[PDB]
Amino acid sequence: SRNLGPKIIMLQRMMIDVFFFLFLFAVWMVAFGVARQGILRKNEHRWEWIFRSVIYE
């Protein structure tokens, strides 16, 4: 494009920052979800809802 090409190519340099962001976010999600689910619920025997309440929410 001569106006969009450089900006599009720039995206290749943000991958490290995105990966760091995702790493921190995933760690926090896992910790908080496991803590809450264990705190305010009893044994769950449905696998889908474990990930639906630990990861998705």
Ligand X SMILES: CC(C)CCC[C@@H](C)[C@H]1CC[C@H]2[C@@H]3CC=C4C[C@@H](OC(=O)CCC(=O)O)CC[C@]4(C)[C@H]3CC[C@]12C
* Binding interface with its own copies (CB under 8 A): 3-4, 7-8, 16-17, 19-20, 23
User: Applying CB under 6 A, does 29 fall inside the site for ligand X?
Assistant: no
Residues across the chain = 57
Segment interacting with ligand X, rule: CB under 6 A, options 7-15, 26-34, 39-47: 26-34
49 binds, among its own copies, ligand X, none (CB under 5 to 8 A by kind): none
Burial of 1 (0-12, 13-18, 19+ CB in 10 A): exposed
54 binds, among ligand X, its own copies, none (CB under 5 to 8 A by kind): ligand X
Tokens of 38: 């264990």
Cα(34)–Cα(57) distance, rounded to whole angstroms? Answer: 11
